[PDB]
Amino acid sequence: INIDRRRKDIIRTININPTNITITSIKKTEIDGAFEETETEIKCVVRIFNEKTAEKQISSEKQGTFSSIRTYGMLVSNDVILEVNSRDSLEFECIYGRMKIVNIYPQIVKGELCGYQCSLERID
């Protein structure tokens, strides 16, 4: 496969049903044995799709109640570099609950990044 073929495919797929997004990145950096958070924001046109037929989990306790589900995937082009770790997060405001980028699968062809396949929790 050629890099340009993959680029055309991902850009077309995003453009069939695009959604403008404002990913807000909160990166934790170690400082004196603790975290210092630097909040940064980015914008990317993105297509959102169902990847799994999962079931909604609810976690109620004295800290609070929140319900998430792992149904929605996500596909984004190469325009912006993304990274999600234990110490890093990427989330954004969809009208039906906030989404949260759990994992990033980078679509690489011959060592050249061409776009990210992604998975989300829609935290209600």
């Binding site: 609810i58 109620s60 004295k62 109640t65």
Partner: protein
Amino acid sequence: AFTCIYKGTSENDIVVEEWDAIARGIRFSVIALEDKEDTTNDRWVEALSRHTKDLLEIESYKDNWKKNFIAPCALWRTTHIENKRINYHLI
């Protein structure tokens, strides 16, 4: 009949999300389930319970608590008995 005694409350105030409710457990207790007579062969206890009832105008239970005790009340159990032959003729 019977008479519940307030003892306390459950461990925490629990929230049950699946039922969508908040719960709390009040903890009561009941005394002397088996006792059903309120009588005694201890003549001393009978005498003092009668004396307390006459003096005080409240119920006076004799040997042990009864489950349907009517507060305010009094009880007159015996805890310890000692007998002595202080003489040839006297005890």
